[PDB]
Tab-separated table of C-alpha atoms in Angstrom:
chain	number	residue	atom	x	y	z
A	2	UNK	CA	0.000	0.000	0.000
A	3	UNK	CA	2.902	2.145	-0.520
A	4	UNK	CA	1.340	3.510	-3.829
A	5	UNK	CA	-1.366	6.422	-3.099
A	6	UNK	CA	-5.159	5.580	-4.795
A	7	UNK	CA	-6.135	7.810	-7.806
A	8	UNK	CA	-7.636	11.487	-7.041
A	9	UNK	CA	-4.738	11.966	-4.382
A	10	UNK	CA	-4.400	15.538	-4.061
A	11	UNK	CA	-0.151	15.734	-3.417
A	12	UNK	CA	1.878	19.141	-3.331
A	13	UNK	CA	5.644	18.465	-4.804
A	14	UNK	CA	8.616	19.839	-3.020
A	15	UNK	CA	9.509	22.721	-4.990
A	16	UNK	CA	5.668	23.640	-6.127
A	17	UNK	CA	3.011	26.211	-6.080
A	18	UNK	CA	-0.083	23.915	-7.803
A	19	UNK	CA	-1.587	21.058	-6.737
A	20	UNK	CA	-1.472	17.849	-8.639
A	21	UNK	CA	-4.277	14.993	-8.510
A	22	UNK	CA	-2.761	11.268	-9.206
A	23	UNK	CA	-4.592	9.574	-12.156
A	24	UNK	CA	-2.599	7.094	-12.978
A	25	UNK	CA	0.153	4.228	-11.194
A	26	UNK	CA	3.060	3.576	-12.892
A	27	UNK	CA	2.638	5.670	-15.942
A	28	UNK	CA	5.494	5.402	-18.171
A	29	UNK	CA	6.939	8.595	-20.106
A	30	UNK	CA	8.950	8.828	-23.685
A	31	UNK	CA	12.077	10.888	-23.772
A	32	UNK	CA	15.054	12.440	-24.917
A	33	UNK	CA	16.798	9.276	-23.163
A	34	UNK	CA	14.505	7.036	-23.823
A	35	UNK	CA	11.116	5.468	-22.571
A	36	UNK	CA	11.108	5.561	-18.778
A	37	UNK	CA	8.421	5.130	-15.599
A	38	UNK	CA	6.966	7.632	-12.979
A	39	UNK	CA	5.294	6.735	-9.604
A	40	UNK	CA	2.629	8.878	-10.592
A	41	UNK	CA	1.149	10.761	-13.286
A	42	UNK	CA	-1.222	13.773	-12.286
A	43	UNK	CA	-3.304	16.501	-13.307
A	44	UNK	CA	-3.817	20.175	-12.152
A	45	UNK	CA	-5.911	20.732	-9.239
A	46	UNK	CA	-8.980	21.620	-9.650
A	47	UNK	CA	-8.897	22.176	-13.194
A	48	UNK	CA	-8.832	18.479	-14.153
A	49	UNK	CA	-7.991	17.175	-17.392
A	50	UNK	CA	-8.590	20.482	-19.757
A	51	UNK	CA	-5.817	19.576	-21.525
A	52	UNK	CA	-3.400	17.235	-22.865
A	53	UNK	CA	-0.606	18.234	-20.010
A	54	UNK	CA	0.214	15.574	-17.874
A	55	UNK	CA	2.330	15.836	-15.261
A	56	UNK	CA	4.874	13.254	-13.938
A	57	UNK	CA	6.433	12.589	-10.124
A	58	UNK	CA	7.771	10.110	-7.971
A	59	UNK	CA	7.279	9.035	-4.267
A	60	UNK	CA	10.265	10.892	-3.229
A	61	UNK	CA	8.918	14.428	-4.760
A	62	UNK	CA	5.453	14.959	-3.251
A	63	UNK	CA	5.797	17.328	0.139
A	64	UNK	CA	2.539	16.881	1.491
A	65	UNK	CA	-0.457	14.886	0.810
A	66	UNK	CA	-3.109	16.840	1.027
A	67	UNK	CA	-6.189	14.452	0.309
A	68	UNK	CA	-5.845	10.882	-0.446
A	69	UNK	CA	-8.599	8.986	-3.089
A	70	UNK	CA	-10.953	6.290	-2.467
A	71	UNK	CA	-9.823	3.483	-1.227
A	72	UNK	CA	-12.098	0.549	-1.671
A	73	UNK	CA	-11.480	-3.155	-1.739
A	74	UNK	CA	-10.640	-2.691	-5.397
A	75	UNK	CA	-7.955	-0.539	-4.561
A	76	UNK	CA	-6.481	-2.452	-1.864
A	77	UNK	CA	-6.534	-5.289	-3.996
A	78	UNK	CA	-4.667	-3.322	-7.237
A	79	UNK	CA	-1.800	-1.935	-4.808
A	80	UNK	CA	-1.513	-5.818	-3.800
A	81	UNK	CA	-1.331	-6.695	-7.378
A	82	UNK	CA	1.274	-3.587	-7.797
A	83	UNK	CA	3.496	-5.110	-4.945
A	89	UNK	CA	8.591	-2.458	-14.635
A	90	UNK	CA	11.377	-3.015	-17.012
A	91	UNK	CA	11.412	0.427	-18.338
A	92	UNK	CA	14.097	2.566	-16.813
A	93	UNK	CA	13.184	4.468	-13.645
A	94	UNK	CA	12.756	8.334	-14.598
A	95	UNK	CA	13.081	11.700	-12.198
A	96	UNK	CA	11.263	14.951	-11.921
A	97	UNK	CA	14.896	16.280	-13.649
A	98	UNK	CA	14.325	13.882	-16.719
A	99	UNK	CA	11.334	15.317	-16.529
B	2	UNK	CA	-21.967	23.329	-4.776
B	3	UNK	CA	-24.170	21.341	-7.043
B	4	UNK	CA	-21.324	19.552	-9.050
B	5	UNK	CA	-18.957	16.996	-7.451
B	6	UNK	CA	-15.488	17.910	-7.192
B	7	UNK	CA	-12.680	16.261	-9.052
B	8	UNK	CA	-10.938	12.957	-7.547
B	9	UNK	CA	-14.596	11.524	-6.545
B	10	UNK	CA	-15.850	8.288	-7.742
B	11	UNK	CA	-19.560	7.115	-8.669
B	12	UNK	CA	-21.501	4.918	-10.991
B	13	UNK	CA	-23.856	5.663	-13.846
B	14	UNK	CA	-27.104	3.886	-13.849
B	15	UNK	CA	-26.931	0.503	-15.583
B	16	UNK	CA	-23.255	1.159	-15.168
B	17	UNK	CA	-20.871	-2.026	-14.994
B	18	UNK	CA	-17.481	0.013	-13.482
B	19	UNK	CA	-16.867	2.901	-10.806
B	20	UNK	CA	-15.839	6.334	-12.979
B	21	UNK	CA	-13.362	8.805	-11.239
B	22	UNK	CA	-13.923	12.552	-11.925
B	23	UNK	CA	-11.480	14.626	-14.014
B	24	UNK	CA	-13.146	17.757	-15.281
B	25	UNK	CA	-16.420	19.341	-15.129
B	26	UNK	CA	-18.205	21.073	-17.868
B	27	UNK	CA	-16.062	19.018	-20.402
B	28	UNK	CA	-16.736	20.023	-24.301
B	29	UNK	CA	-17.279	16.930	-26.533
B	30	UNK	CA	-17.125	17.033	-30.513
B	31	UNK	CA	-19.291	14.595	-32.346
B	32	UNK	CA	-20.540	14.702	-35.648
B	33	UNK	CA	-23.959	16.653	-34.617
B	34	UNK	CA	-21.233	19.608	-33.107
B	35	UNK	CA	-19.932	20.171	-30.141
B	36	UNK	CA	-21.444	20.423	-26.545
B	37	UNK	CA	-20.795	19.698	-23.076
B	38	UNK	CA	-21.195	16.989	-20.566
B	39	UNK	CA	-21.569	17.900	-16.765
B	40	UNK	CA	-18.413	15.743	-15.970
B	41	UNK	CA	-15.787	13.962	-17.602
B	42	UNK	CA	-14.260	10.659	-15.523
B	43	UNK	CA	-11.775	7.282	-16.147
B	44	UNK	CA	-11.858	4.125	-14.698
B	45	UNK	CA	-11.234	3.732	-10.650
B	46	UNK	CA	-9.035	2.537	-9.473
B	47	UNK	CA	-7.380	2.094	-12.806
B	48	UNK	CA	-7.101	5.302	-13.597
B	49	UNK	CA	-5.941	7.099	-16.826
B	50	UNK	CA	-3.765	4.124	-18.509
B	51	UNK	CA	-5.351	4.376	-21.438
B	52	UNK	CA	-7.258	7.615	-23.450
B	53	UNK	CA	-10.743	5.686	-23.070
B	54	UNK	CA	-12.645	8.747	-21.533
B	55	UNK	CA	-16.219	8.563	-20.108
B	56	UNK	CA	-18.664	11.319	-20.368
B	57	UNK	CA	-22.157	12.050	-18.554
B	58	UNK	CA	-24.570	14.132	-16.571
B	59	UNK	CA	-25.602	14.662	-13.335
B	60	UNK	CA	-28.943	12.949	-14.294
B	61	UNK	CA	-26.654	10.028	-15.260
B	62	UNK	CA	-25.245	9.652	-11.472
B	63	UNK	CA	-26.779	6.608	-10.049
B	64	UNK	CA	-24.376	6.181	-6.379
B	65	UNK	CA	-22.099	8.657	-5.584
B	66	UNK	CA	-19.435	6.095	-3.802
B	67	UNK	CA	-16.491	8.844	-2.891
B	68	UNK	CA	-16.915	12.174	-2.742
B	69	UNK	CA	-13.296	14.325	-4.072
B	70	UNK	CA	-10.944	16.983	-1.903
B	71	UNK	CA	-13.062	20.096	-1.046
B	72	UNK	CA	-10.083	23.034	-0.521
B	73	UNK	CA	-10.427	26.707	-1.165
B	74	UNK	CA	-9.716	26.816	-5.133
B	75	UNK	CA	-12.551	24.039	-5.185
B	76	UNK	CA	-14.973	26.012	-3.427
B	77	UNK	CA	-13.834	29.383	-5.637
B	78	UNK	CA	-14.341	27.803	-8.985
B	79	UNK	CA	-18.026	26.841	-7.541
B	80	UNK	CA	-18.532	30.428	-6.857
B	81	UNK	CA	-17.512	30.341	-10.660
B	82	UNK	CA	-19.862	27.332	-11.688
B	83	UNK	CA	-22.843	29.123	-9.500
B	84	UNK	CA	-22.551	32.376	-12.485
B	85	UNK	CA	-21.199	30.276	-15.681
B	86	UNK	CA	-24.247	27.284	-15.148
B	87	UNK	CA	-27.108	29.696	-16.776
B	88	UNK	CA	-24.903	31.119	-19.206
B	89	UNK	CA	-23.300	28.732	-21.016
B	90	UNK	CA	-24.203	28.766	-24.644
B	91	UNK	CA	-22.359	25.636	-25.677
B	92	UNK	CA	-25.759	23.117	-26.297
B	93	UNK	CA	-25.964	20.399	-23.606
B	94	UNK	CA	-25.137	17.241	-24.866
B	95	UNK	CA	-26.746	13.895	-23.352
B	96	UNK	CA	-25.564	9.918	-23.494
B	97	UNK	CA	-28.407	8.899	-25.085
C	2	UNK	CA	-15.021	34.982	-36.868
C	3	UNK	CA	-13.147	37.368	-33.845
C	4	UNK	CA	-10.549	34.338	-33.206
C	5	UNK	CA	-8.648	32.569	-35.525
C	6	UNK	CA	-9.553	28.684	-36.525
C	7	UNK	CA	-7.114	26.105	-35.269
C	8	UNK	CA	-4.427	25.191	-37.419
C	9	UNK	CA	-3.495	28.969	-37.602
C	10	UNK	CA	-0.043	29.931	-37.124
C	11	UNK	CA	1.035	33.401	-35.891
C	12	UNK	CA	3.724	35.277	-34.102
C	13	UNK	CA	3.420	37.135	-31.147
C	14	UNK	CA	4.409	40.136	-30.233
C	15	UNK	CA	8.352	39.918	-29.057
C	16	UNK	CA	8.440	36.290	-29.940
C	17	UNK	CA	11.059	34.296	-30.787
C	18	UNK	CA	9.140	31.494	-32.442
C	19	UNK	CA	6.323	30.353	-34.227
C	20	UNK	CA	3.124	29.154	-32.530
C	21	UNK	CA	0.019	26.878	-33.751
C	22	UNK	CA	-3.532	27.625	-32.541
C	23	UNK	CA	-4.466	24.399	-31.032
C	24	UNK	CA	-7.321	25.526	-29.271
C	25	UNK	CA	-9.627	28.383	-28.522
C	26	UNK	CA	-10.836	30.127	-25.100
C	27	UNK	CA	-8.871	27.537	-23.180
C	28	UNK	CA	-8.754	27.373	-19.316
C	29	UNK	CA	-5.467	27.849	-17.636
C	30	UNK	CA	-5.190	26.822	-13.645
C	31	UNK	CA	-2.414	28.969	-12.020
C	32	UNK	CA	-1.632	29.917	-8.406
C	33	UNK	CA	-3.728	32.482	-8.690
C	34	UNK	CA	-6.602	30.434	-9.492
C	35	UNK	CA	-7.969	29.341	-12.735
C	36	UNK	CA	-8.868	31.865	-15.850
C	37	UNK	CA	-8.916	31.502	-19.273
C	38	UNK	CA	-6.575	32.752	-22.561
C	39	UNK	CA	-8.325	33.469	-26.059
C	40	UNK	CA	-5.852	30.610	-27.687
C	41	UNK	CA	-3.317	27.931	-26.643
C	42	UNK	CA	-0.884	26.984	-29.003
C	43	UNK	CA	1.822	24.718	-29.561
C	44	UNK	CA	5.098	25.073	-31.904
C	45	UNK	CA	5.670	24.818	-35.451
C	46	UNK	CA	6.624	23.105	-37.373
C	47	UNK	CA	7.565	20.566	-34.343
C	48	UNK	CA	4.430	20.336	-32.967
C	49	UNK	CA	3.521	18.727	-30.120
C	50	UNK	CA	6.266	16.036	-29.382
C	51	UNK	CA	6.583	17.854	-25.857
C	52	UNK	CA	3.794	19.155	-23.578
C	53	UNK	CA	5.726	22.838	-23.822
C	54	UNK	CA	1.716	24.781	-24.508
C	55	UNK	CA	1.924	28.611	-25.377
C	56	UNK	CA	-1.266	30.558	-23.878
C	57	UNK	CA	-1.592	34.546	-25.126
C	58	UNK	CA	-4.760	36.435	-26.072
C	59	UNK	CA	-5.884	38.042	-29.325
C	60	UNK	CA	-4.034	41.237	-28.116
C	61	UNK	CA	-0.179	39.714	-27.980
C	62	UNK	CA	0.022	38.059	-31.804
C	63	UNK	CA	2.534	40.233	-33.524
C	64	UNK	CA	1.418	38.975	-36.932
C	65	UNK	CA	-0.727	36.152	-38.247
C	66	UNK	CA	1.435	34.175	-40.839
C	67	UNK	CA	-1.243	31.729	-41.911
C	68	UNK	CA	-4.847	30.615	-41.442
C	69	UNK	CA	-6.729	27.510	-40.908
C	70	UNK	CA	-9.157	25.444	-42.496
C	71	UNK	CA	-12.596	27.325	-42.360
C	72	UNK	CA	-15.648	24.327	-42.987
C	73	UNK	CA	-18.926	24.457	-41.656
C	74	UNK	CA	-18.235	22.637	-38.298
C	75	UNK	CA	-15.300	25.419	-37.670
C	76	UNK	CA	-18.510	28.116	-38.792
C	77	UNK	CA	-20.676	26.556	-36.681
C	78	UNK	CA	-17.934	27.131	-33.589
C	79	UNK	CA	-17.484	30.554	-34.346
C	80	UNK	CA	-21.482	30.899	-34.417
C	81	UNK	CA	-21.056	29.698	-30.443
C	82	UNK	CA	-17.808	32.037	-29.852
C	83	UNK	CA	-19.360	35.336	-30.676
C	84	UNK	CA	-22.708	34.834	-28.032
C	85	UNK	CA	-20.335	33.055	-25.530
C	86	UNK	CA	-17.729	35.467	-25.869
C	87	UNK	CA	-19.919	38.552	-23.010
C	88	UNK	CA	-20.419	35.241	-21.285
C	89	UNK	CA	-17.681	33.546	-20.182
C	90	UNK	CA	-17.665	34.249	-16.044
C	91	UNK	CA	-14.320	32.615	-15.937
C	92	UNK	CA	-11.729	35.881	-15.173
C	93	UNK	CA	-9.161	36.771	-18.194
C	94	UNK	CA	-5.702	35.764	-17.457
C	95	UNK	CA	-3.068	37.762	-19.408
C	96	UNK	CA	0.558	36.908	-20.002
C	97	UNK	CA	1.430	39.416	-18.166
C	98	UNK	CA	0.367	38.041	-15.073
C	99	UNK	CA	2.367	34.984	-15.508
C	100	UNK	CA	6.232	34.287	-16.705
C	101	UNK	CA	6.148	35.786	-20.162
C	102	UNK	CA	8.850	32.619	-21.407
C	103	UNK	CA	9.476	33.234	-25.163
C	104	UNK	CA	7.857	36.719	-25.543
D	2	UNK	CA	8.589	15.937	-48.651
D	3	UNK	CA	5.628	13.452	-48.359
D	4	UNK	CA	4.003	13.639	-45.011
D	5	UNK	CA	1.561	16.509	-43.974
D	6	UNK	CA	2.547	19.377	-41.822
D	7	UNK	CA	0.859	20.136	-38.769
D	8	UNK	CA	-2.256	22.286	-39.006
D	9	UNK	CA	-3.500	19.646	-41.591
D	10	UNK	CA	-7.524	18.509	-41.274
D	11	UNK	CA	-7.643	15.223	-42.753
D	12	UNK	CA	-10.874	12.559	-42.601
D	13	UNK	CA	-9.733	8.921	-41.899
D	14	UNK	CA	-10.964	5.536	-43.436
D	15	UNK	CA	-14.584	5.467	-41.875
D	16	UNK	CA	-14.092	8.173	-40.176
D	17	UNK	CA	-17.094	9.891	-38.655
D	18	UNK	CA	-15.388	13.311	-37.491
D	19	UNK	CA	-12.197	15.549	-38.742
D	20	UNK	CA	-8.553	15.508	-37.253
D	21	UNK	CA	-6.434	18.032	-37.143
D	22	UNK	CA	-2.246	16.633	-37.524
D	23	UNK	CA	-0.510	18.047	-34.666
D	24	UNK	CA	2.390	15.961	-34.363
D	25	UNK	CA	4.663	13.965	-36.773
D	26	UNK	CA	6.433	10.496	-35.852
D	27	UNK	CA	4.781	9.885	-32.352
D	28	UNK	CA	5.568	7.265	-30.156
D	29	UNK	CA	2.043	5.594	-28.783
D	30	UNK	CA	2.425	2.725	-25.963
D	31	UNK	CA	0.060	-0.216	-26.399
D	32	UNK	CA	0.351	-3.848	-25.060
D	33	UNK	CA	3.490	-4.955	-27.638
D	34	UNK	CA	5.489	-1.997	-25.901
D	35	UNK	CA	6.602	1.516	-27.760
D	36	UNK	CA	5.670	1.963	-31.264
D	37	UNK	CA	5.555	4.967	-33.217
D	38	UNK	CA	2.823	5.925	-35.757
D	39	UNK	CA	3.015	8.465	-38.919
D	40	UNK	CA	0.886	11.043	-37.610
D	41	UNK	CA	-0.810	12.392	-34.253
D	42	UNK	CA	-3.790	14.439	-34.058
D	43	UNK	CA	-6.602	16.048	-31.952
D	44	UNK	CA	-10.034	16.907	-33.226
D	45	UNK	CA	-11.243	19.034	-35.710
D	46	UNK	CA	-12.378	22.052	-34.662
D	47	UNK	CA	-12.178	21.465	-31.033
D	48	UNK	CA	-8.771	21.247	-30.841
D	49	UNK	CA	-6.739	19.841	-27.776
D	50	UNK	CA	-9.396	20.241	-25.155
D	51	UNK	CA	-8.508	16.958	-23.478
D	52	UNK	CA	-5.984	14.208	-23.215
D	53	UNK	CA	-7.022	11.929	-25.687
D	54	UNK	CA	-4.667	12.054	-28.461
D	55	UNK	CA	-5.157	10.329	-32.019
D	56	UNK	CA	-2.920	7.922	-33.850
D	57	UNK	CA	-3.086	7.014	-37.487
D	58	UNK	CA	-0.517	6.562	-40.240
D	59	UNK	CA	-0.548	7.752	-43.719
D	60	UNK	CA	-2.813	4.719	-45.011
D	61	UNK	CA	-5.437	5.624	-42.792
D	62	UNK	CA	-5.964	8.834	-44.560
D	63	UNK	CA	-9.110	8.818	-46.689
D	64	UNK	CA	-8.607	12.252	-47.601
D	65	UNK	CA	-6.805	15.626	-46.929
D	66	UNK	CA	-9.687	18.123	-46.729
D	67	UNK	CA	-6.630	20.849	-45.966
D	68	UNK	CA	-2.674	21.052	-45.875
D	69	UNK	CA	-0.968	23.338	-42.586
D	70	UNK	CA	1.267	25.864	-42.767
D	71	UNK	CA	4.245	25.005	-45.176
D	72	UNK	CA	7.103	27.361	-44.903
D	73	UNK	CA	10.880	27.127	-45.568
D	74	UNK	CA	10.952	25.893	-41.685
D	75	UNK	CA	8.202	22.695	-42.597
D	76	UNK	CA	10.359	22.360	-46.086
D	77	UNK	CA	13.642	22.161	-43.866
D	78	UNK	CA	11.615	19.689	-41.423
D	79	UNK	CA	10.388	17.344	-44.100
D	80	UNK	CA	14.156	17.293	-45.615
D	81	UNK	CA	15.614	16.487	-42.545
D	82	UNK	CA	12.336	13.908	-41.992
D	83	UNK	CA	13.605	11.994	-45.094
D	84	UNK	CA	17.191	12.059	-43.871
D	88	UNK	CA	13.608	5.512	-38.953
D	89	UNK	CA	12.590	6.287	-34.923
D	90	UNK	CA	13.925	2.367	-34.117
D	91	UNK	CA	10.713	1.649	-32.923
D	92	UNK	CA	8.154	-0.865	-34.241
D	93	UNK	CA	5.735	0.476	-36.759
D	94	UNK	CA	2.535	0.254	-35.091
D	95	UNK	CA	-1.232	0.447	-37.247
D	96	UNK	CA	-4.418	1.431	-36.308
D	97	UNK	CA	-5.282	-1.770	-35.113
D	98	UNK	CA	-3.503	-0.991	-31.937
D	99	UNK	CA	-5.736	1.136	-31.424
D	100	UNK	CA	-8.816	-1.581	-30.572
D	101	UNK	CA	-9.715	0.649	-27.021
């Protein structure tokens, strides 16, 4: 359960938005190559208006300000969660 | 506050998986033009792996399961949504 | 027809490249809450192989180097743009209000 | 010189609405892994209002209902496009949801 649930509202470390996790394990193309997040998010509240996702690890949120529903389907996907791709940070990013 | 806020979860009626919020007032383009749908959502707890996007109204919600963060630049873009709602001249598009 | 179709490429005003209408009244979130910008636009010829969006208003192109298709459905839009346009209660961001990067 | 700038509105085989190309050579992830298609494209004339992003290569064009902005830039783009991303060549058929 070391993952957080989708609709996580998370501030980064060096940040002035908020971010919203919609997806686990999203993976991101690059100059280096084709790489994995932790997290991929959206602006809070503005949602998906756009095509501009945004990208973070564990190690880069600050505060969690709101965590998503949790229901049995979650608990079971973060037991299914505990990739080959190489391991990207918020720099590659 | 009549719209849910982003991040919460419910099911459609005759609905067969749980559909996270990720905008409100979303525009959709089909071949008749383009309108709006009271919300857009993605698959819980999936989330956004893929670019299959869901679209309905409020009339559509059949259990509202979670319920999404409700900070101060939520509650200022419903003092937004409270003015817009009567004004928007997009049409109103429906899933049927 | 106020705003340009998509597709149209223009330069703004102190720019230092060229930018693609990919969309028209488009919300922008910032830390000073959410507004909207009369186009967002992406660069050309590139494109969007990066998520690097340009946001100005009608008021900061420079010059409009080219114009996009016109049909019936992009009619039909601009039909909706000029009854919307008193009627949008989201505020107007301007680029001056934000880090004017590339202008 | 062959493939379509960006700004071009284009209807695909069966295709019930217009796209407009804003991207060339774009890498699209699908169950096989990484694979790149000729074109991406958002909506026509809605834009990029959202995250969905379409994928389609040249075949898939049933017509070209307008060409973008061609300059000495997009002529200098398509010469150096000519002058191979190492990724498999993926169809529309990844595409099945």
């Amino acid at each position: 359960s070391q993952l957080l649930p989708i609709g996580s509202v998370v501030r980064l470390n060096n940040g002035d938005v908020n971010l919203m996790v919609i997806s686990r394990y999203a993976l991101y193309e690059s100059d280096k190559g084709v790489g994995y997040f932790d997290y991929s998010a959206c602006l809070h509240p503005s949602g998906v208006i756009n095509q501009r996702t945004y990208y973070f690890n564990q190690e880069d949120i600050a505060e969690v300000l709101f965590e998503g529903f949790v229901n049995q389907a979650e608990r079971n996907m973060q037991q299914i969660f505990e990739i080959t791709y190489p391991h990207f940070t918020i720099k590659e990013f």
